[PDB]
């Protein structure tokens, strides 16, 4: 009784951004999000173009790009359109509502102008969502709430995770899903994206902990895997991206029946 | 048995950044931090120069500055040195450790190059501190941990606040204090900075809640008030800044004895 991505795209209460994402996931047979954690625009754009066909989403940290310009994001949008993926700026908004409005819309980055999706921490209360929504809703954008984290010592557990789910439910015109390690909402309209994913077990020296695609998608019920170093540090990023795509997509299919 | 700012500056376990801050607070008789939430470099630099003598710290959001350049931060450093205040970039780092390293050091903003202090959320676990420390410690910088928030619905309460205090204790070579609404640590080496401060009662429409200087400093035991709109929206920002300085400084003095 679990709906395919394609069916989820047609759900009555689905956000237009999620519906576009779910349709291209189904069409392209990819539930992989590339975490393009690179410091040079040329590498960001070469990864986006080569791996574009293999991904449903490209997750950015534009505040690490040494040569950021708006023209770089224009070229990135051209590739997102060509290859059909969404752009997700992983900014983790977590300030008071009044402040996040200007961070999302303005400054040098003008995130709301090119980011299909942003994410936000729920620790400040619902004002963080309300502030972002004042910019994002008129621009037809979506937001993800951070309901759990993959890093050691995370405090996003128990009642904190529950607060994030309730917050999402109550703001469904803008909040389209979660960053979590597992399915945290029983409503199929919400997307679940899981970072801290690698084919092999382990972590890093700065608190990151990894789980496999089959575990996160197949057993823990998430929709999309967010993968950075497992792809970016490989020699052949395209075959690495294809390996992760096949793992996550088959895990999804075997969960469907 | 409460030590003056001047004495706290000499405590054996005090961080060099906190000691410099505590000395200038004492010398200038100001425990006021100006939240310079403006979008134009000219207004940021005109506020820093005119209110510099009245402040112990200028808190920035460089990601809302429409015309940010590194030369703007050079001119801001010239004013911080001239007038003797610290610069605090209110970035609220809250990502995995590996990611925050590059956000703090690199990108367009090169925050670590000009920010005496940054702050960080504790929700990801201690990896956020460890990541920032790898850049900040070699540069002799300090970090503040967000132990409580002033916004409605905040989840930074109870065991979350306690986790932030423990995290600070265990990283005292880099963590110099807290963003909180009250004294949360009994160790005088740590600084307590409190936002959500205005002379009059009220809030905003996006979740902000205000308390007075006398309440935050005098009754709740914080060290420094962080004030934005109560100064920036006033016609005469200098007299507004002087009003807040006198409130916070007298409240401190009456707490001493
Ligand atoms: O809870 C989270 C939330 C976000 N991320 C992001 O996902 C990417 C993973 O990068 P990787 O380890 O190289 O695969 C990084 O950009 C970080 S901030 C997490 O990791 N955990
Ligand atoms: O828990 C917090 C942490 C930080 N701040 C920041 O302090 C400033 C207050 O701005 P004001 O309302 O205009 O005085 C803003 O930049 C916000 S992000 C809080 O408010 N609460």
Numbering used by the authors:
A (entry chain A), B (entry chain A): 223 to 479
Which lines from the publication concern this structure?
Specifically, the 2′–OH group interacts with residues Thr321 and the catalytically relevant Asp317, both of which are contributed by the second monomer. Thus, we explored these interactions by substituting the 2′–OH group with a larger thiol group that is less electronegative but more nucleophilic. As we were unable to purify this analog to homogeneity, we were unfortunately unable to test binding and enzymatic turnover. However, we were able to solve the crystal structure of human OMPDC in complex with it. The ligand 2′-SH UMP binds in the active site in a defined manner, and its 2′-thiol group is well resolved due to the strong electron density. Compared to the structure of OMPDC with UMP, the thiol group displaces residue Asp317′ by ∼2 Å, while the remaining residues of the catalytic tetrad retain their positions. Thus, the interaction of the 2′-SH group with Asp317′ is lost, and a new hydrogen bond between Lys314 and 2′-SH is formed with an interatomic distance of ∼3.2 Å. Akin to UMP’s 2′–OH group, the 2′-SH still interacts with Thr321′ from the second monomer. Based on the crystal structure, we speculate that, although sulfur is a better nucleophile, its size prevents proper binding because it displaces Asp317′ from the active site. This finding further supports our previous observations that substrate binding in OMPDC involves not only direct interactions between the ligand and protein residues in the active site but also an extended hydrogen bond network between the two monomers, which is sensitive even to minor changes.
Orotidine 5′-monophosphate decarboxylase (OMPDC) converts orotidine 5′-monophosphate (OMP) into uridine 5′-monophosphate (UMP) and CO2 during the final step of de novo pyrimidine synthesis, which is essential for producing DNA and RNA nucleotides. Recognized as one of the most efficient enzymes, OMPDC accelerates the decarboxylation rate by a factor of 1017, and exhibits a net transition-state stabilization (ΔG #) of 31 kcal/mol. Its unique ability lies in achieving this substantial enhancement without the aid of bioorganic cofactors or metal ions, relying solely on interactions between the substrate OMP and residues at the active site. However, the key catalytic amino acids at the active site are highly conserved, including two lysines (K281, K314) and two aspartic acids (D312, D317), which form the so-called catalytic tetrad in the sequence Asp317-Lys314-Asp312-Lys281 (numbering from the human enzyme).
